[PDB]
C-alpha cells in the first residue's frame, strides 16, 4: 500500500515506455493500443466470412444473397454482404441475436467488420501523427491519409446514416462495390456532381503527376553505374548528396511547356504532389457524404426546349435513360410504392 | 459449380512457372561470392 504504489507506478511507466518506444519494429503507440485489436477482429471476421458465411438477407425481404466462396462465389463475385434492411441503422452485435445462425442470416458480420475497421483506420491515422511526433518529424502525413479515411467513412457509415440503413453501405466485395456504384449513379447522378468530378481530376491528376515526377527524376539521374548495372545501385541509402540533377530536369520540363510552368523548388513541387490528390479525394468523399443527404448531381433532364415546347435531348438526357434502366431494375422485389425515397 | 476443368492447372502453372523463375534467380544471386 505504501511504496507499493510506486512499484505499480514505475511498472506503468515501463509499459508506457514500451508502448511509445521508437525502437519497436512496428510502432505500437497509444493509438496502436486501440488499432491493433480492432483491425485484428475486423480482419479475422472478414476472412472467415468471405470464405464461409451463408447467404445474407441484405434488403430485408427474405431474399438472401450469397457472398462467400464456399457458397458459390469466386474472388470477383464474393463479398461480405451488408446487414438487413429490416435492421436499418439499429446496432446489431452478436449478443443481440438469438443465435449465430440468426446473426449470419441478417448480416451481422458486416456490422462487426465495418465498425472495427473504421475504428482501426481512424487510429491508424492517429498513429501516423504519433510516430512522427516521436521521431521529430513534421506532423502532416496523417492529414494526407485523412483523405482515404474520409472516403471509407463516407461509403461505410455516412451514406448508410443518411439513407437510414447499413443495407445501403458499400458491400465488402469486388462485384458488390460495382453494385453500390451503379445504384448510386441511378439515385444521385454522381457523374454529374462536381465533387465527384473533382475526385476524378484528383486521381487522374495524381496518376499523371506521379508518372510525370517519376519520369523527370528518373530522366536526370547522375551517372554512377555502368550499362550492365541497374542505375538504382547509383544511389546509396542515406547518402547526403542528391542523386539527380534537378537543374537538368527543370531545364527539360521548362522547355516542354514553358519555363514558368515548371517547379524549380523541390519543396513547392512535393507540396503540390501531396495537395492535388488529397484535395480531390477530400472533395469526392464529401460528394458521397452529401449525396448521403440527397443533394445530388446536376439535373439537366429536358433543359433544352425548342420554340414549340418540344424537348431537344442532350447527352444529359441519354445519361438519364441509363439511370432509369438501373433505377427500375435494382432490388426488383423491394419496392411496393412508386417512388424510391431512400 | 461447373467451372472450367483446366482452370486449376492454368492457375497453378501461372503461379508456379514465374515464381520458380524468380526463386532460381534470387537463390543463385545469394550464393554468389560476396
Amino acid at each position: 500500500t505504501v511504496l507499493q504504489r510506486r512499484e505499480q507506478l514505475n511498472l506503468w511507466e515501463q509499459f508506457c515506455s514500451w508502448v511509445t518506444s521508437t525502437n519497436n519494429r512496428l510502432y505500437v503507440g497509444w493509438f496502436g493500443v486501440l488499432m491493433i485489436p480492432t483491425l485484428l477482429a475486423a480482419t479475422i471476421c472478414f476472412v472467415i466470412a468471405f470464405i464461409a458465411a451463408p447467404p445474407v438477407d441484405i434488403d430485408g425481404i427474405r431474399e438472401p444473397v450469397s457472398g462467400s466462396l464456399l457458397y458459390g462465389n469466386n474472388i470477383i463475385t464474393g463479398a461480405v454482404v451488408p446487414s438487413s434492411n429490416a435492421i436499418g441503422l439499429h446496432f446489431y452485435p452478436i449478443w443481440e441475436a438469438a443465435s449465430l445462425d440468426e446473426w449470419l442470416y441478417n448480416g451481422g458480420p458486416y456490422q462487426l467488420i465495418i465498425f472495427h475497421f473504421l475504428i482501426g483506420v481512424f487510429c491508424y491515422m492517429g498513429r501516423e501523427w504519433e510516430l512522427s511526433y516521436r521521431l521529430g518529424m513534421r506532423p502532416w502525413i496523417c492529414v494526407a491519409y485523412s483523405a482515404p479515411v474520409a472516403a471509407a467513412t463516407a461509403v461505410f457509415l455516412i451514406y448508410p446514416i443518411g439513407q437510414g440503413s447499413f443495407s445501403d453501405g458499400m458491400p465488402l466485395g469486388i462485384s458488390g462495390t460495382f453494385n453500390f456504384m451503379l445504384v448510386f449513379q441511378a439515385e444521385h447522378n454522381i457523374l454529374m456532381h462536381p465533387f465527384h468530378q473533382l475526385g476524378v481530376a484528383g486521381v487522374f491528376g495524381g496518376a499523371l503527376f506521379s508518372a510525370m515526377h517519376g519520369s523527370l527524376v528518373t530522366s536526370s539521374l547522375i551517372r554512377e553505374t555502368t550499362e550492365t548495372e541497374s542505375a538504382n545501385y547509383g544511389y546509396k541509402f542515406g547518402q547526403e548528396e542528391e542523386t539527380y540533377n534537378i537543374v537538368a530536369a527543370h531545364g527539360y520540363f521548362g522547355r516542354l511547356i514553358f519555363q514558368y510552368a515548371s517547379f524549380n523548388n523541390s519543396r513547392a513541387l512535393h507540396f503540390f504532389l501531396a495537395a492535388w490528390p488529397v484535395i480531390g479525394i477530400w472533395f469526392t468523399a464529401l460528394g458521397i457524404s452529401t449525396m448521403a443527404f440527397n443533394l445530388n448531381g446536376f439535373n439537366f433532364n429536358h433543359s433544352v426546349v425548342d420554340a414549340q415546347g418540344n424537348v431537344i435531348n442532350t447527352w444529359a438526357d441519354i445519361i438519364n435513360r441509363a439511370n432509369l434502366g438501373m433505377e427500375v431494375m435494382h432490388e426488383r422485389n423491394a419496392h411496393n410504392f412508386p417512388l424510391d425515397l431512400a | 459449380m461447373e467451372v472450367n476443368q483446366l482452370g486449376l492447372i492454368a492457375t497453378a502453372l501461372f503461379v508456379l512457372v514465374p515464381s520458380v523463375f524468380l526463386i532460381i534467380l534470387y537463390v543463385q544471386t545469394e550464393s554468389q561470392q560476396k
Binding site: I51, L69, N74, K236, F237, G238 | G7, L8
Partner: peptide, 30 residues
C-alpha cells in the same frame, strides 16, 4: 477445388507479407 485455390493464393500472399516485413533486406547506412 476453386475455393481451395483462391484461399491458397491468399494464404501465400499473407505469408509473403510476413517475410517481406520481418525478413527484409535491412536498410543500411554506409
Amino acid at each position: 477445388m476453386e475455393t481451395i485455390t483462391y484461399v491458397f493464393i491468399f494464404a501465400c500472399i499473407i505469408a509473403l507479407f510476413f517475410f517481406a516485413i520481418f525478413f527484409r533486406e535491412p536498410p543500411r547506412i554506409t
